[PDB]
Amino acid sequence: DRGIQMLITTVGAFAAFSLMTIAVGTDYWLYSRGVCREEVMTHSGLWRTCCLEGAFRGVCKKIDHFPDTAEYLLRAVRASSVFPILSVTLLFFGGLCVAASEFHRSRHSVILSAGIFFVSAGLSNIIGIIVYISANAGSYSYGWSFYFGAFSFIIAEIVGVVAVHIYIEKHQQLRA
Amino acid sequence: DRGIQMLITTVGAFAAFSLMTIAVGTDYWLYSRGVCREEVMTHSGLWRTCCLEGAFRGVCKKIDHFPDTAEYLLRAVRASSVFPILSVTLLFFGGLCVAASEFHRSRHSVILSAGIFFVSAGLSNIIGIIVYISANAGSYSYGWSFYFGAFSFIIAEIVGVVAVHIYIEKHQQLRA
Amino acid sequence: DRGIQMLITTVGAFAAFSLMTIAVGTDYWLYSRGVCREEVMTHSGLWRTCCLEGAFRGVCKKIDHFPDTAEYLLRAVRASSVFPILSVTLLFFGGLCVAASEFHRSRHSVILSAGIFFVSAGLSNIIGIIVYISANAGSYSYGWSFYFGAFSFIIAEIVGVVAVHIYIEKHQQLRA
Amino acid sequence: DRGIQMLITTVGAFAAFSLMTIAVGTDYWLYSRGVCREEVMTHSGLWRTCCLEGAFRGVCKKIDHFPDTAEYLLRAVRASSVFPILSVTLLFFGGLCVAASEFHRSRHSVILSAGIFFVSAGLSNIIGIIVYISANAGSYSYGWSFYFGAFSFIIAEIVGVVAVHIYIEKHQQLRA
Amino acid sequence: SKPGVFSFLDPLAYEIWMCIVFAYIGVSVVLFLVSRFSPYEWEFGIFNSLWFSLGAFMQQGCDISPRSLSGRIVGGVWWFFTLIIISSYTANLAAFLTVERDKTSALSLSNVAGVFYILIGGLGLAMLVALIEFCYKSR
Amino acid sequence: SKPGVFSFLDPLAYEIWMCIVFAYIGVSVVLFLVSRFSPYEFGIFNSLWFSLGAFMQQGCDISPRSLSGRIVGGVWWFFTLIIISSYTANLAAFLTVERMVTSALSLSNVAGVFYILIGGLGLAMLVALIEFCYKSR
Amino acid sequence: SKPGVFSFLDPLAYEIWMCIVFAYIGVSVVLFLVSRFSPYEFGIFNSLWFSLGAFMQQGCDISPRSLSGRIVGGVWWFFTLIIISSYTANLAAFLTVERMVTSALSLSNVAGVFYILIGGLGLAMLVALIEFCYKSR
Amino acid sequence: QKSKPGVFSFLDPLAYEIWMCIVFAYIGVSVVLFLVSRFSPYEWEFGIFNSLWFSLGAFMQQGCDISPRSLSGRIVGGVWWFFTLIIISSYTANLAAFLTVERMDKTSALSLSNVAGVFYILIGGLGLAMLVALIEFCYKSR
């Protein structure tokens, strides 16, 4: 099933990257009641907050991420969105390795490194989610951008598993 | 124990079906204080509630199940009592399969089917009980109708096990 | 080590029986502040309570005991000291079997039955202790009679395990 | 790694002994508010307490360990500090055995003895710490003397493991 | 308020205990069924299924674990059920012992006497069953 | 209020439950990865089973032998211990403050776990039938 | 008052602890007895290890296979579950009614378990030496 | 006011000294289990690394792949089991105490902020595990 395995890997890599990039770009992470500058229903993201109703509707303001070493570090890490961006970067590199595999079949480690990138991307994604939620804590709901991030994590982990299976079966088949 | 196994299976199938059908029919599930019209001691089943002391002793009335979507679904499921009825249906089909197995000795799966039906009847029975209890409490005692349901569950599970044993022994002896 | 095993068995059987009989006889189970007929320091047993100081010192009465099915049964069982006495009886029978073993070496089960008696005696002893303590609950300290009972339990169990090891080794050696 | 194993063992033996001896000697176990004569910040060891700011800065005085039998025993054990001293003694004997092992190559057990001494030193060390902590608290901070004790424990345990490995390898190579 | 011999059952309602027993039987039977009729393989007979389930509920672990996907689903949900139920027992017992309906007493033998009686009864029953099995298998 | 069907989840916030699930996947995948590229049977399915059983503080048929497998296993064990104790402790808190304001738990405030249980048994039977038919043809 | 060295035993009365020890012996002996006179390695020392591990909810290397062994094991499992839960629940009670009259527990009110631990390690080393010398000569 | 939850607030039920002594006890138990299992020349699976794994799993109540078979090994194991049981019960009980009574009665669900530290340690461990696996691979492949 190597053809189908590679198909799943490529499609999944693209899906994970697309979902994560959209999530990092779009601004529907959180539905709360803040202000775009009275408090009204808003819809914040990683960078901008926007009004969902009333006169200033459609108006978005850069999130004042900033207004205790631990609080400072959390606020810094959440302000720069280090971890969502790092997960996007790693998904990009994983996709590059998956693409490069076919054009260079001599070396095996290419697809293995794809798998490792995807797994690492998932881990960064988790750290991002935790940091984001924790930083918010310092009524509400989660939007579709948040769930795009979550689905990116799941798909990334699946694609990592499939990639490692491709590498394993290549070495198992060739070695014996 | 082949003959004895089949005898246990048949007797048990009939016993489980009879007990569960009686339980679903009779009206001694719950003993509680209420009115079948001051409130007197009564006894309720799945459908009728009836006073057992007073001027209106022996009078009965349809329960008003419908005097919070989860509450609505619980009320619906407990009003139809779909689960006790489904348990009776599956016991009926299991008994029918046990009867048929005596004919089509060629096809083993018949008795296996019996087994599965009985097991499934047990599961639906337990759901029934939980739903019933969950809906009621949302003093008192349990009557003999309730315990008929409980004993039906136990016997159904025993007969399921015995049926599956018969099928296993068929496919083992055949291999020998 | 069969000689030494039998020596341990006999000595232990006698020790357990002696300790348990003394415990059931003597009156130093509990040090509390009751009355032999003002409250003074006493020393009760299974049957009699006695004054430890003052004018009426050395004067002992009979534990009332009898002065709610569960409470009734506990009080009845504790009043008659069923379980300490049963443990004494079983230790006696175990000792009889141990003695009879040597005079009849044809049959093996004699020492096995000795072991079983001793094990059972220990269990009765435990039930007695629990019943006694629980019945008392319905400041204080435990006397040397109590600890004689406890040591009887331990020794009885150790003699039971040695007896069963004698039987096992006889059947193992003879069978092969 | 035989030469390297012995080098680690010797260096570690010396390091553990030196650290523990310094810790037992120096006077920076605890930083707390008190008087070496209003109370100023101070630092205490096992024996002396000394002020580190004020008119009497640099002054020292013997701790009054003795200003409840369990409390008395704790006070006694913490006053003598028998356990830190015993830890130093055992580390000394372990080091001596490690030195001697280089001579009496005929008798393996020498190095095994070293191992055991070190392990035992670790245990006495931990008891020391517990006793110390248990007695003190019966704000504050821990100085570098305390942490010297802790690192002594860790190194002692590592050297014990390595010594036992050396002995195991001797008795394995000999069998070969 | 005399504790009462079986007062250790008090944290959970009688209906929860009875449904625990029914769930136990249902789990054991389904584990047996999904482990057997699969003719690819045919150690999870009915008696071993009951033992696996009992040990899972008591958090005593196992001598055998399911290897199939179906067996593992059954095992997994039974593990989750067990975790919630036992935590619920401990939590509710903590509630009753903290707030009487203010000092706290050590539990006395009277508060757990029932569990001792069930234990010693089980040991007696086990010895009886061993004798019966012996007499059966020796003839 | 009458207890809700999934009220047994209340001691921990929804985000904790969601992150438990993600952590579970991440642990299983890393255990699988470190085990297959390590000198010295943790396939992905067995990795998932090991991790599930570890979180439920239940049995393991297999434990990791490598240093990397043991690191993964050790941190997952620690996480499990903290999270389960936190669940029990916070449930005790909710029930003690409700008693302060028989209090035996009723079938109603654990009914959700029964529904999930019986649903799982149903699903297990379905999967068994599917796998059986697949292996038949 | 300053906590006592063996204050960790306080949640259960002295009689409970003593009866736990007796129940432990009785269980171990009955498991040994039913296992050696049963159609179908539980000698007395393995029985005593199985029982200890069961009470500490620390699993086992061997489980009983017979019906009588499994009855004994089952009731000992049930007893263990109730008794451990009772310990934890009553300890939570004692610590809550204190906070209602330092948050963290201090080394002093678990010092006894450390002493018992190190005592056990010392005893273990002594027994190892004794057994070794015995097997040498 | 209510102290906002700290990372590592999951350690709060037990004093810092208890945690450090738990770590020392862990090392001591592992080393003594190794020692009493080995130098007995009658037998010589409880090497030092396996001893550490047995001890870790015992403390986390995750059971074992191997149990001690000697009397000395079983004594060590038994006291470590008892210690574990008391300490973990103490942790749960004291956490329940802190969550019930505020000492700067509505009671709220634990938030991710209350346990964020444990997640960070977890993901740190996964990262570390992957790094160690790479290092082992490179070492053993040369």
Ligand SMILES: CCCCCCCC/C=C/CCCCCCCC(=O)OC[C@H](O)CO
């Ligand atoms: C044999 C292989 C074993 C390897 C796997 C073992 C993993 C188990 C333990 C993990 C927790 C360790 C980290 C504990 C967290 C420390 C946090 C800390 O020190 O916090 C400081 C404090 O918050 C200042 O304010």
Ligand SMILES: CCCCCCCC/C=C/CCCCCCCC(=O)OC[C@H](O)CO
């Ligand atoms: C497969 C082999 C398994 C066999 C071994 C399994 C043992 C596990 C369960 C034991 C508890 C059973 C008894 C439960 C106690 C019931 C008490 C009761 O019903 O009490 C009535 C109430 O007190 C009225 O007021």
Ligand SMILES: CCCCCCCC/C=C\CCCCCCCC(=O)OC[C@H](O)CO
């Ligand atoms: C390899 C292993 C194979 C895996 C084997 C499967 C078993 C997994 C176990 C248990 C989790 C299931 C219980 C959780 C159920 C989720 C539903 C729920 O909690 O509902 C809340 C509701 O959404 C209100 O908002």
Ligand SMILES: CCCCCCCC/C=C\CCCCCCCC(=O)OC[C@H](O)CO
């Ligand atoms: C199977 C081979 C045998 C296994 C090896 C045995 C290990 C036992 C482990 C833990 C229990 C012992 C620890 C408990 C000791 C009690 C301490 C104590 O008594 O302190 C209170 C004191 O009496 C003030 O009142």
Ligand SMILES: CCCCCCCCCCCCCCCC(=O)O
């Ligand atoms: C998986 C099996 C675990 C054992 C469960 C124990 C069952 C206890 C007895 C259940 C019957 C009803 C008991 C409650 C009676 C009451 O006091 O109201």
Ligand SMILES: CCCCCCCCCCCCCCCC(=O)O
């Ligand atoms: C091995 C780890 C897996 C453990 C499985 C535990 C089940 C998790 C369920 C989480 C569902 C999330 C829904 C939150 C509930 C709510 O907010 O109403």
Ligand SMILES: CCCCCCCCCCCCCCCC(=O)O
């Ligand atoms: C497998 C069961 C054995 C478990 C071992 C637990 C240790 C029991 C210790 C009991 C000692 C009795 C002293 C009571 C304490 C007191 O009253 O001060």
Ligand SMILES: CCCCCCCCCCCCCCCC(=O)O
């Ligand atoms: C057997 C090992 C179990 C794991 C134990 C985790 C150790 C936690 C870290 C110990 C160091 C001190 C931490 C407490 C610091 C504080 O917040 O005061």
